[PDB]
Coordinates of C-alpha atoms and ligand atoms in Angstrom, one line a residue:
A2 CA -50.9 119.1 -121.8
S3 CA -54.3 115.9 -122.7
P4 CA -54.6 113.4 -120.1
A5 CA -53.4 110.6 -122.8
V6 CA -49.8 112.3 -123.0
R7 CA -49.5 112.2 -118.5
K8 CA -49.9 109.3 -119.3
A9 CA -47.7 108.1 -121.7
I10 CA -45.2 109.8 -120.6
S11 CA -45.3 107.9 -116.6
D12 CA -45.6 105.3 -119.0
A13 CA -42.5 105.4 -120.9
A14 CA -41.0 106.2 -118.0
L15 CA -41.8 103.4 -115.9
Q16 CA -39.0 101.5 -118.3
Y17 CA -36.2 103.4 -117.2
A18 CA -35.0 104.5 -113.4
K19 CA -32.2 106.9 -111.9
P20 CA -29.3 105.9 -110.8
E21 CA -29.0 106.8 -106.9
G22 CA -27.4 110.2 -106.4
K23 CA -26.8 111.8 -109.5
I24 CA -27.7 115.4 -109.5
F25 CA -27.2 116.1 -113.3
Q26 CA -26.1 119.6 -114.8
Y27 CA -26.0 121.0 -118.5
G28 CA -22.5 122.2 -118.1
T29 CA -20.8 123.6 -120.8
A30 CA -22.3 122.0 -124.0
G31 CA -24.9 119.9 -122.6
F32 CA -25.7 117.7 -120.2
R33 CA -22.4 114.9 -120.6
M34 CA -21.2 111.5 -118.3
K35 CA -20.8 108.4 -118.1
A36 CA -23.0 106.0 -120.8
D37 CA -24.3 104.0 -118.5
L38 CA -25.8 106.9 -116.3
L39 CA -28.1 108.3 -119.3
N40 CA -31.2 107.0 -119.7
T41 CA -33.2 108.8 -118.2
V42 CA -31.2 112.7 -118.7
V43 CA -31.8 111.7 -122.7
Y44 CA -35.7 110.3 -121.4
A45 CA -36.0 114.2 -120.2
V46 CA -34.5 115.8 -122.7
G47 CA -36.7 114.2 -125.5
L48 CA -39.2 116.3 -123.3
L49 CA -38.1 119.4 -123.4
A50 CA -37.5 119.3 -127.2
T51 CA -41.1 118.2 -127.6
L52 CA -42.3 122.1 -125.5
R53 CA -39.4 123.9 -127.1
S54 CA -40.1 122.6 -130.4
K55 CA -44.4 123.9 -129.4
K56 CA -43.0 127.0 -127.9
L57 CA -41.6 128.0 -131.5
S58 CA -44.7 127.1 -133.6
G59 CA -43.3 123.7 -134.0
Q60 CA -40.0 124.8 -136.0
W61 CA -38.0 121.8 -135.7
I62 CA -34.9 121.7 -132.7
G63 CA -32.5 119.2 -133.1
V64 CA -31.0 116.6 -130.7
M65 CA -27.5 115.6 -131.4
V66 CA -26.0 112.2 -128.9
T67 CA -22.1 112.5 -128.4
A68 CA -20.0 113.3 -126.0
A69 CA -17.5 115.1 -129.1
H70 CA -13.8 115.3 -127.3
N71 CA -14.9 113.0 -124.7
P72 CA -13.5 109.1 -124.4
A73 CA -15.3 106.3 -125.5
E74 CA -17.5 105.8 -122.3
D75 CA -19.1 108.6 -122.1
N76 CA -22.0 109.8 -123.7
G77 CA -24.2 113.0 -123.8
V78 CA -26.9 115.1 -125.6
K79 CA -27.2 118.6 -126.8
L80 CA -30.5 120.9 -128.0
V81 CA -30.4 122.8 -131.4
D82 CA -32.4 125.8 -131.8
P83 CA -34.3 126.7 -135.0
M84 CA -31.9 128.1 -136.9
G85 CA -28.2 126.1 -136.1
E86 CA -27.7 128.1 -132.7
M87 CA -27.1 126.2 -129.7
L88 CA -30.2 125.8 -127.3
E89 CA -31.5 129.5 -125.7
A90 CA -29.3 129.4 -122.2
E91 CA -32.8 129.8 -119.5
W92 CA -34.0 126.7 -121.5
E93 CA -30.8 124.8 -119.8
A94 CA -32.7 125.1 -116.6
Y95 CA -35.7 124.1 -117.1
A96 CA -33.9 121.0 -118.8
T97 CA -32.1 120.4 -116.0
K98 CA -35.5 120.8 -114.1
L99 CA -36.8 117.8 -116.3
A100 CA -33.4 116.2 -115.8
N101 CA -33.7 116.5 -112.0
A102 CA -37.4 115.4 -111.2
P103 CA -37.5 111.9 -109.7
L104 CA -39.4 110.1 -112.4
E105 CA -42.4 109.1 -110.5
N106 CA -43.0 113.1 -111.0
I107 CA -41.9 114.2 -114.8
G108 CA -44.8 114.2 -116.2
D109 CA -46.0 117.1 -113.3
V110 CA -43.0 119.1 -113.2
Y111 CA -43.4 118.9 -117.7
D112 CA -47.0 120.6 -117.1
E113 CA -45.8 122.7 -114.0
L114 CA -43.1 123.5 -117.6
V115 CA -46.0 124.4 -119.5
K116 CA -48.0 127.0 -117.3
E117 CA -43.9 128.9 -116.5
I118 CA -43.1 128.5 -120.3
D119 CA -46.6 128.7 -121.1
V120 CA -47.0 126.8 -124.2
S121 CA -49.6 126.3 -126.4
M122 CA -49.5 123.1 -126.2
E123 CA -51.9 122.3 -129.2
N124 CA -48.9 123.5 -131.3
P125 CA -46.7 120.5 -133.2
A126 CA -43.3 119.2 -132.2
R127 CA -40.9 118.7 -134.5
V128 CA -37.8 117.4 -133.2
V129 CA -34.7 116.2 -135.7
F130 CA -31.7 113.9 -134.2
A131 CA -28.8 111.9 -135.1
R132 CA -25.5 110.7 -132.8
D133 CA -21.8 109.5 -133.2
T134 CA -20.8 106.8 -133.5
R135 CA -20.6 106.0 -129.6
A136 CA -21.9 102.2 -128.4
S137 CA -24.1 103.5 -126.2
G138 CA -25.5 105.7 -128.9
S139 CA -28.4 103.6 -130.2
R140 CA -29.6 102.6 -127.1
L141 CA -29.8 105.7 -126.2
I142 CA -32.3 107.0 -130.0
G143 CA -34.5 104.0 -128.3
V144 CA -34.7 106.3 -125.1
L145 CA -35.1 109.6 -127.2
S146 CA -38.4 107.9 -129.3
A147 CA -39.7 106.4 -126.5
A148 CA -39.6 110.1 -125.2
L149 CA -40.8 111.3 -128.3
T150 CA -43.8 109.1 -129.0
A151 CA -44.6 109.9 -125.4
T152 CA -45.5 113.2 -126.4
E153 CA -46.9 113.3 -130.3
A154 CA -43.9 114.9 -131.6
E155 CA -43.6 114.4 -135.2
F156 CA -39.5 113.4 -135.7
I157 CA -37.0 112.1 -137.7
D158 CA -33.7 109.6 -136.6
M159 CA -30.6 110.8 -139.2
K160 CA -28.6 108.0 -138.1
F161 CA -25.1 109.0 -137.9
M162 CA -24.2 112.5 -138.5
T163 CA -21.0 114.8 -137.9
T164 CA -22.3 117.7 -135.2
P165 CA -21.9 120.2 -137.5
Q166 CA -24.1 117.6 -140.4
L167 CA -27.2 118.1 -137.9
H168 CA -27.2 121.7 -136.9
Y169 CA -27.1 122.5 -140.7
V170 CA -30.4 119.7 -141.3
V171 CA -31.6 121.7 -138.5
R172 CA -31.6 125.2 -140.3
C173 CA -32.7 124.4 -142.5
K174 CA -35.6 122.6 -142.0
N175 CA -36.8 125.5 -140.6
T176 CA -35.9 128.4 -143.9
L177 CA -36.6 125.7 -146.5
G178 CA -39.0 127.5 -149.1
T179 CA -37.8 131.4 -147.9
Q180 CA -36.0 134.1 -148.8
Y181 CA -34.0 132.7 -145.6
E182 CA -33.5 129.2 -147.3
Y183 CA -30.0 127.7 -146.3
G184 CA -30.4 124.2 -148.0
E185 CA -31.3 120.5 -148.8
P186 CA -32.0 119.3 -145.7
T187 CA -29.9 116.2 -146.1
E188 CA -26.9 114.9 -145.9
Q189 CA -26.0 115.0 -149.3
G190 CA -27.7 118.3 -149.7
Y191 CA -24.5 119.5 -146.9
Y192 CA -22.0 118.3 -149.5
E193 CA -22.7 119.8 -152.3
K194 CA -23.8 123.4 -150.0
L195 CA -19.6 122.5 -149.4
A196 CA -19.0 121.4 -151.8
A197 CA -20.1 124.3 -154.0
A198 CA -18.7 127.4 -152.3
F199 CA -15.4 125.6 -151.5
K200 CA -15.8 125.6 -155.9
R201 CA -16.1 128.9 -155.7
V202 CA -14.1 130.8 -153.2
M203 CA -11.4 128.7 -154.5
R204 CA -11.3 130.4 -158.5
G205 CA -8.2 130.8 -159.9
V206 CA -6.1 129.4 -157.1
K207 CA -4.2 125.8 -155.8
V208 CA -4.1 124.3 -153.2
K209 CA -0.4 123.4 -152.7
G210 CA 0.6 119.8 -151.2
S211 CA -1.3 117.4 -149.7
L212 CA -3.8 116.8 -146.4
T213 CA -3.0 114.2 -144.1
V214 CA -6.4 114.6 -141.5
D215 CA -6.2 112.7 -138.5
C216 CA -10.4 112.1 -137.8
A217 CA -10.4 110.5 -134.0
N218 CA -11.6 107.3 -135.1
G219 CA -15.1 109.0 -135.5
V220 CA -18.3 109.7 -138.2
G221 CA -15.8 112.7 -139.7
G222 CA -14.0 109.7 -141.5
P223 CA -16.5 108.0 -143.5
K224 CA -18.1 112.1 -143.8
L225 CA -14.5 113.1 -144.8
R226 CA -14.5 110.7 -147.4
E227 CA -18.3 110.7 -148.5
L228 CA -17.7 115.0 -148.7
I229 CA -14.7 114.3 -150.7
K230 CA -16.7 113.2 -153.7
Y231 CA -18.4 115.9 -154.0
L232 CA -15.0 118.7 -154.2
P233 CA -14.4 120.5 -157.1
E234 CA -11.2 118.9 -158.8
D235 CA -9.1 121.0 -160.1
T236 CA -8.1 122.6 -156.9
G237 CA -5.0 120.8 -156.0
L238 CA -6.2 120.0 -152.6
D239 CA -5.2 116.4 -152.3
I240 CA -6.5 114.7 -148.9
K241 CA -5.0 111.9 -147.4
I242 CA -7.8 109.9 -143.8
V243 CA -6.0 108.9 -141.2
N244 CA -7.6 107.2 -138.0
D245 CA -11.5 106.6 -139.4
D246 CA -12.2 103.3 -137.8
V247 CA -15.3 103.9 -136.5
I248 CA -16.0 100.1 -136.3
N249 CA -14.2 99.7 -132.5
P250 CA -15.0 101.4 -129.9
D251 CA -12.1 102.1 -128.3
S252 CA -10.8 103.4 -131.1
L253 CA -13.1 106.9 -130.8
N254 CA -10.2 110.3 -129.8
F255 CA -8.5 107.8 -127.9
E256 CA -4.3 108.3 -129.1
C257 CA -5.2 111.1 -131.3
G258 CA -7.6 113.6 -132.6
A259 CA -7.7 117.4 -131.7
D260 CA -7.8 117.4 -128.1
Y261 CA -4.8 114.8 -128.0
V262 CA -2.7 117.4 -130.0
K263 CA -3.7 120.3 -127.8
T264 CA -3.6 119.0 -124.7
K265 CA -0.1 116.9 -125.3
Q266 CA 1.7 119.0 -127.9
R267 CA 2.2 116.9 -130.0
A268 CA 1.7 114.1 -133.3
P269 CA -0.7 111.0 -132.9
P270 CA 2.1 108.2 -131.6
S271 CA 0.1 105.8 -135.1
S272 CA 1.4 109.3 -137.2
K273 CA 2.8 108.5 -140.0
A274 CA 3.6 111.9 -141.8
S275 CA 7.1 113.1 -143.4
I276 CA 9.3 116.7 -142.9
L277 CA 7.3 119.6 -144.0
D278 CA 3.3 117.3 -145.0
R279 CA 0.9 119.6 -144.1
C280 CA -1.2 117.8 -141.1
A281 CA -5.3 118.9 -138.7
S282 CA -7.0 116.9 -136.9
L283 CA -10.8 116.7 -136.4
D284 CA -11.7 115.2 -132.7
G285 CA -14.9 112.4 -132.1
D286 CA -18.0 114.2 -133.3
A287 CA -15.7 116.8 -136.0
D288 CA -16.3 120.2 -134.6
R289 CA -12.8 120.8 -133.4
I290 CA -10.3 121.1 -135.5
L291 CA -6.5 121.9 -135.5
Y292 CA -3.9 121.8 -138.0
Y293 CA 0.1 120.9 -137.3
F294 CA 3.4 120.1 -138.7
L295 CA 6.3 118.6 -138.6
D296 CA 9.3 121.4 -139.2
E297 CA 12.6 121.4 -141.3
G298 CA 14.1 120.8 -138.2
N299 CA 12.0 117.7 -137.2
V300 CA 10.5 119.3 -134.6
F301 CA 6.4 119.8 -134.3
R302 CA 4.8 122.9 -134.4
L303 CA 0.9 123.7 -133.4
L304 CA -1.6 125.2 -135.2
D305 CA -4.5 125.7 -133.0
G306 CA -8.0 127.5 -133.0
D307 CA -6.1 130.6 -132.7
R308 CA -4.4 130.4 -134.7
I309 CA -7.3 129.6 -137.9
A310 CA -9.2 132.4 -136.0
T311 CA -6.4 135.0 -136.6
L312 CA -5.7 133.7 -140.4
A313 CA -9.6 134.5 -141.4
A314 CA -9.4 137.5 -139.1
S315 CA -6.1 138.8 -141.7
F316 CA -7.3 137.1 -144.9
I317 CA -10.9 138.9 -144.4
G318 CA -9.1 141.8 -143.6
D319 CA -7.3 142.1 -146.9
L320 CA -10.1 140.7 -149.4
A321 CA -12.6 143.9 -147.6
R322 CA -9.5 146.3 -148.3
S323 CA -8.5 145.3 -151.5
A324 CA -12.7 144.8 -152.6
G325 CA -13.2 149.1 -151.6
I326 CA -15.1 147.8 -148.1
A327 CA -12.6 147.8 -145.1
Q328 CA -14.4 151.0 -143.3
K329 CA -17.8 149.4 -144.0
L330 CA -16.8 145.3 -143.1
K331 CA -15.0 146.1 -139.0
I332 CA -14.0 142.6 -138.0
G333 CA -13.3 141.9 -134.1
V334 CA -12.2 138.9 -132.6
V335 CA -13.0 136.6 -129.5
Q336 CA -11.3 134.3 -127.2
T337 CA -11.2 133.0 -124.1
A338 CA -9.0 133.1 -122.1
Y339 CA -6.8 129.7 -122.9
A340 CA -5.6 131.4 -126.0
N341 CA -1.9 131.9 -126.2
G342 CA -0.9 135.3 -124.8
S343 CA 0.8 136.0 -128.1
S344 CA -2.1 135.0 -130.3
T345 CA -3.5 138.2 -128.4
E346 CA -0.8 140.4 -128.7
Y347 CA -1.6 139.4 -132.9
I348 CA -4.9 140.2 -132.9
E349 CA -3.8 144.0 -131.5
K350 CA -0.7 144.9 -132.5
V351 CA -0.4 143.3 -135.8
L352 CA -3.9 143.5 -137.0
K353 CA -5.0 146.3 -134.8
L354 CA -8.4 144.7 -134.9
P355 CA -10.4 144.7 -131.2
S356 CA -10.7 141.4 -129.4
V357 CA -13.1 140.1 -127.2
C358 CA -12.7 137.7 -123.7
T359 CA -15.0 135.5 -123.2
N360 CA -16.2 132.5 -120.9
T361 CA -15.3 128.8 -122.2
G362 CA -18.3 127.4 -125.1
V363 CA -19.5 128.0 -128.2
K364 CA -22.9 129.9 -126.9
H365 CA -20.4 133.2 -125.5
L366 CA -18.5 133.7 -128.2
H367 CA -21.3 133.3 -130.4
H368 CA -23.3 135.5 -128.4
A369 CA -20.0 137.9 -128.4
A370 CA -19.2 137.9 -132.0
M371 CA -22.8 139.9 -132.3
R372 CA -21.5 142.8 -131.5
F373 CA -19.2 142.6 -134.8
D374 CA -19.6 143.1 -138.9
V375 CA -17.2 140.3 -139.3
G376 CA -16.9 137.5 -135.9
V377 CA -13.8 135.7 -136.0
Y378 CA -14.4 133.7 -133.2
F379 CA -12.1 130.2 -132.0
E380 CA -11.7 128.5 -128.8
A381 CA -7.4 127.1 -129.0
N382 CA -9.2 123.4 -128.9
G383 CA -10.0 124.0 -132.7
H384 CA -13.8 125.7 -132.2
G385 CA -14.9 128.0 -133.7
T386 CA -16.6 130.3 -136.9
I387 CA -17.2 133.1 -138.2
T388 CA -19.8 135.1 -138.9
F389 CA -21.2 138.4 -140.8
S390 CA -23.8 140.4 -139.6
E391 CA -27.1 141.3 -141.6
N392 CA -25.6 144.6 -142.0
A393 CA -22.0 143.2 -143.9
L394 CA -24.2 140.6 -145.5
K395 CA -26.1 143.4 -147.3
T396 CA -22.7 145.5 -147.5
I397 CA -20.7 141.5 -149.0
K398 CA -24.3 141.0 -151.5
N399 CA -24.8 145.4 -152.9
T400 CA -21.8 146.5 -152.7
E401 CA -20.8 147.5 -157.0
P402 CA -16.7 148.1 -157.1
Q403 CA -15.1 150.6 -159.3
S404 CA -12.6 147.8 -161.0
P405 CA -12.1 144.1 -161.9
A406 CA -9.5 143.0 -159.1
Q407 CA -12.2 144.8 -156.5
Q408 CA -15.0 142.9 -158.0
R409 CA -12.7 139.3 -157.6
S410 CA -11.9 140.3 -154.1
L411 CA -15.3 140.8 -153.3
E412 CA -17.0 137.9 -155.4
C413 CA -13.9 136.2 -153.2
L414 CA -15.5 137.8 -149.9
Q415 CA -19.3 135.8 -150.7
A416 CA -17.8 133.2 -151.6
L417 CA -16.6 133.0 -148.2
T418 CA -20.2 133.8 -146.6
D419 CA -21.4 130.2 -148.3
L420 CA -18.3 128.2 -147.1
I421 CA -18.3 129.0 -143.3
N422 CA -20.6 127.3 -140.8
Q423 CA -22.7 130.4 -139.5
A424 CA -23.6 129.6 -135.5
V425 CA -21.5 127.0 -134.3
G426 CA -18.9 126.6 -136.0
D427 CA -18.0 123.1 -138.1
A428 CA -15.0 121.4 -137.8
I429 CA -14.4 120.6 -141.6
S430 CA -15.9 123.4 -142.9
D431 CA -12.7 125.1 -141.3
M432 CA -10.4 123.1 -142.3
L433 CA -11.6 124.2 -146.2
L434 CA -11.2 127.1 -145.5
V435 CA -8.0 127.7 -143.9
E436 CA -7.3 125.6 -146.9
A437 CA -8.6 128.3 -149.7
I438 CA -6.8 130.9 -147.1
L439 CA -2.9 129.7 -147.1
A440 CA -3.7 128.4 -151.5
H441 CA -4.8 132.6 -152.0
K442 CA -2.1 133.5 -149.7
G443 CA 0.4 131.4 -151.7
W444 CA 2.1 130.5 -148.2
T445 CA 3.0 127.3 -147.0
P446 CA 2.8 126.5 -142.5
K447 CA 6.1 127.6 -142.4
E448 CA 5.0 130.8 -143.0
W449 CA 1.3 130.7 -141.1
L450 CA 3.5 129.3 -138.0
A451 CA 6.0 132.4 -138.4
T452 CA 3.2 135.3 -137.9
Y453 CA 4.2 135.4 -134.4
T454 CA 5.5 133.1 -131.7
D455 CA 3.4 131.4 -129.4
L456 CA 4.4 131.6 -125.4
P457 CA 5.7 127.7 -124.1
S458 CA 2.4 126.8 -122.6
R459 CA 1.1 123.1 -120.1
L460 CA -1.8 122.4 -119.4
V461 CA -2.9 120.3 -116.1
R462 CA -6.1 118.2 -116.0
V463 CA -7.5 118.1 -112.3
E464 CA -9.0 115.8 -110.5
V465 CA -10.7 116.6 -107.0
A466 CA -13.7 115.8 -105.3
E467 CA -15.9 118.8 -105.5
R468 CA -14.8 121.1 -108.7
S469 CA -18.9 123.3 -107.7
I470 CA -16.4 125.1 -105.1
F471 CA -14.4 126.3 -107.7
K472 CA -15.9 129.1 -108.8
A473 CA -14.4 132.0 -111.5
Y474 CA -15.0 134.7 -112.8
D475 CA -14.5 137.6 -114.9
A476 CA -14.0 135.5 -118.4
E477 CA -14.1 132.7 -115.5
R478 CA -9.5 134.2 -115.3
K479 CA -10.0 134.4 -111.9
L480 CA -11.4 132.2 -108.6
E481 CA -14.0 133.8 -106.2
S482 CA -14.0 130.1 -104.7
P483 CA -12.0 128.6 -102.9
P484 CA -11.2 131.6 -100.3
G485 CA -7.6 132.3 -100.7
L486 CA -6.6 130.2 -103.7
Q487 CA -6.1 133.6 -106.6
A488 CA -4.5 135.0 -104.2
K489 CA -1.4 132.2 -104.5
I490 CA -2.3 132.0 -108.5
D491 CA -2.1 135.9 -108.7
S492 CA 1.4 135.0 -106.6
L493 CA 3.1 132.0 -108.5
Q494 CA 2.8 134.1 -112.7
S495 CA 4.2 136.9 -110.8
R496 CA 7.4 134.9 -111.0
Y497 CA 7.6 133.9 -114.3
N498 CA 8.6 136.4 -117.4
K499 CA 5.0 136.7 -119.4
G500 CA 3.7 134.6 -116.4
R501 CA -0.8 133.9 -116.8
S502 CA -2.2 130.9 -115.1
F503 CA -6.0 130.4 -114.4
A504 CA -7.9 127.6 -113.5
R505 CA -12.1 126.8 -113.6
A506 CA -14.4 123.3 -113.1
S507 CA -14.5 121.7 -116.2
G508 CA -18.0 121.7 -117.8
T509 CA -17.8 118.4 -119.7
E510 CA -15.6 116.6 -117.9
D511 CA -15.2 115.9 -113.6
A512 CA -12.1 117.8 -113.5
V513 CA -10.6 121.0 -112.5
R514 CA -8.2 122.9 -116.1
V515 CA -5.2 124.2 -115.0
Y516 CA -3.4 126.9 -118.5
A517 CA -0.3 128.3 -117.3
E518 CA 2.1 129.6 -120.3
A519 CA 5.1 131.6 -119.7
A520 CA 8.6 133.1 -122.1
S521 CA 9.9 129.9 -121.8
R522 CA 9.1 126.2 -121.6
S523 CA 10.5 125.6 -117.7
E524 CA 9.2 128.5 -116.7
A525 CA 5.6 127.2 -118.5
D526 CA 5.9 123.5 -116.8
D527 CA 6.8 125.4 -113.3
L528 CA 3.9 127.5 -112.9
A529 CA 1.3 124.7 -114.6
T530 CA 2.8 121.8 -111.8
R531 CA 2.8 124.5 -108.5
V532 CA -1.3 126.2 -109.5
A533 CA -2.1 122.3 -110.1
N534 CA -0.4 120.8 -106.5
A535 CA -1.8 124.7 -105.3
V536 CA -5.7 123.6 -106.5
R537 CA -5.3 119.5 -106.3
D538 CA -4.3 120.3 -102.8
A539 CA -7.9 122.5 -101.9
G540 CA -9.6 120.0 -103.6
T541 CA -9.1 117.1 -102.0
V542 CA -9.6 118.4 -98.3
Ligands
LIG601 O1 -16.4 118.4 -126.1 P1 -16.9 120.2 -127.7 O2 -16.3 119.7 -128.3 O3 -18.4 119.6 -127.4 O4 -16.3 120.8 -126.4 C1 -17.0 121.3 -125.6 O5 -16.1 121.5 -124.4 C2 -14.9 122.8 -124.8 C3 -14.3 122.2 -123.1 O6 -15.2 123.0 -122.0 P2 -15.1 122.7 -120.7 O7 -13.1 123.5 -120.1 O8 -15.6 123.4 -119.6 O9 -14.7 120.8 -120.4 C4 -15.6 124.1 -124.9 O10 -14.2 124.8 -124.8 C5 -16.7 123.9 -125.6 O11 -16.6 124.9 -126.1 C6 -17.9 123.0 -125.7 O12 -18.6 123.4 -126.6
LIG602 CL1 -20.0 106.6 -139.6
LIG603 CL1 -6.8 120.6 -118.9

């Protein structure tokens, strides 16, 4: 790196101060913490984004400033690689080295990195960024801008966007004018693509009943309202938006949003939904969705990420069979350990498909899903998508089927591949997917719920002094450490019918998570509470 660059790096860093004693870690999805801790971190990330882009011969790299499901006082920064995927895993160590460098030395760490990565410093760097509605985002975008200006990257501020909009923009700008061309790299282009794909998938069917979408008082509320202006007119889809208060920042994810619904297993307390109204909740950056409704008995029923995965795997399997291509589109379902055991059992015994369990975090699920022609992957919390391999897409595009029924199914599959946000999932595209599926099957939430019955389950968020002593393995289902704790968990889970519990450190918040399921409500709650007390005791010595 040039002497003027190395100077502008140290000059710009002078404006900030590292918080004393904090060690930063990349975590499940990127640096995330209380927003007053973030300046030097974000500055470090601007440096890393420049290096990444240069290493990739000036391809657009994205930065999304968000803490996603986290409470409003947090923020964070996620890196996006050129095709929309999460920043390559090996590069999380480089980010963490820059973020932990004394500020005085950040210039030297930068040069140390150019040598180690072997980066051609004459390559252009091109970075595009956006943020959700969080109060700290503008300050952090200032810092990011300061880093990128110092390193002389070309950069574009896309203002407020959902996480998946930013991933979409990155993929578009890196594919524009090629055979791979994903769309126009603007917010309008995103709405146009979703709308056009949904029109095609919907040919010949209609949605029945309204959909009431809790938008977590985040950026998804205004963007979904905008998307609705683009959507086709006679599909029967009737969306009502609730919780779109992007004006009061304390409202974000507050008593509403997918994370509230999933962890508490209840509708937002401000919900005005009637019995049998079909509902869904997005989260604060619109990258999770779940569904839920009040049944005929006025009882809340949850349709979470694994319900979406299984819904999509069933539909795709029926379309591939109908299109005469079942033998050529092998479907697999990727899960994590948070998936309800009943959903795993359904995938195995009713859909008759392979499933794979991976670590928590979309990067891991996406990785495992590459092993299938069609890889359906969701986390229970409502992240996820469906990936189609090169060979699958070629089969879907080029098959010429014998009859009109087969052609209609083939065309529905082709449209689905344009609707489904490839790589990292997109909650709003997943919502249109679910709507299209129910419309084709003719199902209401009643029939979808009846596919399988979830085991009663429970999440407990446990605060400990030192979550780094909780080290997990086997798709994070067992604790290697602290010594003796897995033994206790194995012993506890065996006392309950269908008892299954595991504990692991969160990589997005300072807590340990406990999950438990069993055959009955009393058993699952007892198992979760006894496991959480064993964790709290261990983590708090
Ligand atoms: O907040 P988001 O929507 O970015 O979600 C992030 O955190 C979730 C919880 O991770 P953990 O249990 O380590 O805290 C993960 O399941 C998810 O893949 C990740 O992208
Ligand atoms: Cl907004
Ligand atoms: Cl939890």
